[PDB]
Amino acid sequence: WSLDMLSHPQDSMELVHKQSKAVAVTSMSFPVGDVNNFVVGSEEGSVYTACRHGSKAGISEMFEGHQGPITGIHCH
Amino acid sequence: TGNVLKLKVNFLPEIITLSKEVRNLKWLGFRVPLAIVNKAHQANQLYP
């Protein structure tokens, strides 16, 4: 959401498709050091590089690797 | 004492179940029943 506009989270950059499922992200933190990579880490790895918009705000360049729920998700 | 009353809802009825359901549909629809899958379909984008 915007810094002044947070009456609803506007930029709903869903790091999933538009199907019918609770495709969650375990402890999906953004990248540490302000690299802004909102790593949406699903229950079976899939640490999606969920960004703001474009054709890369999700699981396109998924920086996964976690054997299980990718929870500690924050870059260097 | 005094027959006073607070309020409550049914969102709290599946807190840990919603956490497990979110993780289940997060990976692939984990080892749960079919009714749990239908409940996940009717609750995933409906918990608001």
Swiss-Prot record, chain A:
Subcellular location: Cytoplasm, Cytoskeleton; Cytoplasm
Protein origin, superkingdom: Eukaryota
Repeat (WD) residue spans along the chain: 20-60
Post-translational modification as stated in the protein's UniProt record: Pyrophosphorylation by 5-diphosphoinositol pentakisphosphate (5-IP7) promotes interaction with DCTN1. Serine pyrophosphorylation is achieved by Mg(2+)-dependent, but enzyme independent transfer of a beta-phosphate from a inositol pyrophosphate to a pre-phosphorylated serine residue.
Function (record text): Acts as one of several non-catalytic accessory components of the cytoplasmic dynein 1 complex that are thought to be involved in linking dynein to cargos and to adapter proteins that regulate dynein function. Cytoplasmic dynein 1 acts as a motor for the intracellular retrograde motility of vesicles and organelles along microtubules. The intermediate chains mediate the binding of dynein to dynactin via its 150 kDa component (p150-glued) DCTN1. Involved in membrane-transport, such as Golgi apparatus, late endosomes and lysosomes.
Disease: Neurodevelopmental disorder with microcephaly and structural brain anomalies: An autosomal recessive neurodevelopmental disorder characterized by global developmental delay, severe intellectual disability, microcephaly, dysmorphic facial features, and cerebral malformations including simplification of cerebral gyration, agenesis of the corpus callosum, and brainstem and white matter hypoplasia.
Membership in a protein family: Belongs to the dynein intermediate chain family.
Subunit structure: Homodimer. The cytoplasmic dynein 1 complex consists of two catalytic heavy chains (HCs) and a number of non-catalytic subunits presented by intermediate chains (ICs), light intermediate chains (LICs) and light chains (LCs); the composition seems to vary in respect to the IC, LIC and LC composition. The heavy chain homodimer serves as a scaffold for the probable homodimeric assembly of the respective non-catalytic subunits. The ICs and LICs bind directly to the HC dimer and the LCs assemble on the IC dimer. Interacts with DYNLT3. Interacts with DYNLT1.
Protein name per UniProt: Cytoplasmic dynein 1 intermediate chain 2
Organism of provenance: Homo sapiens
Recorded name of the encoding gene: DYNC1I2
Portion of the full sequence shown: 410 to 485 of 638
Swiss-Prot record, chain B:
Stretches that traverse the bilayer: none
Location(s) in or outside the cell: Cytoplasm, Cytoskeleton
Family from the record: Belongs to the dynein heavy chain family.
Domain free text: Dynein heavy chains probably consist of an N-terminal stem (which binds cargo and interacts with other dynein components), and the head or motor domain. The motor contains six tandemly-linked AAA domains in the head, which form a ring. A stalk-like structure (formed by two of the coiled coil domains) protrudes between AAA 4 and AAA 5 and terminates in a microtubule-binding site. A seventh domain may also contribute to this ring; it is not clear whether the N-terminus or the C-terminus forms this extra domain.
Task performed by this protein: Cytoplasmic dynein 1 acts as a motor for the intracellular retrograde motility of vesicles and organelles along microtubules. Dynein has ATPase activity; the force-producing power stroke is thought to occur on release of ADP. Plays a role in mitotic spindle assembly and metaphase plate congression.
Disease: Charcot-Marie-Tooth disease, axonal, type 2O: An axonal form of Charcot-Marie-Tooth disease, a disorder of the peripheral nervous system, characterized by progressive weakness and atrophy, initially of the peroneal muscles and later of the distal muscles of the arms. Charcot-Marie-Tooth disease is classified in two main groups on the basis of electrophysiologic properties and histopathology: primary peripheral demyelinating neuropathies (designated CMT1 when they are dominantly inherited) and primary peripheral axonal neuropathies (CMT2).
Assembly, per entry: Homodimer. The cytoplasmic dynein 1 complex consists of two catalytic heavy chains (HCs) and a number of non-catalytic subunits presented by intermediate chains (ICs), light intermediate chains (LICs) and light chains (LCs); the composition seems to vary in respect to the IC, LIC and LC composition. The heavy chain homodimer serves as a scaffold for the probable homodimeric assembly of the respective non-catalytic subunits. The ICs and LICs bind directly to the HC dimer and dynein LCs assemble on the IC dimer. Interacts with DYNC1LI1; DYNC1LI1 and DYNC1LI2 bind mutually exclusive to DYNC1H1.
Protein name listed in UniProt: Cytoplasmic dynein 1 heavy chain 1
Species: Homo sapiens (Human)
Taxonomic placement: Eukaryota, Metazoa, Chordata, Craniata, Vertebrata
Encoding gene, per UniProt annotation: DYNC1H1
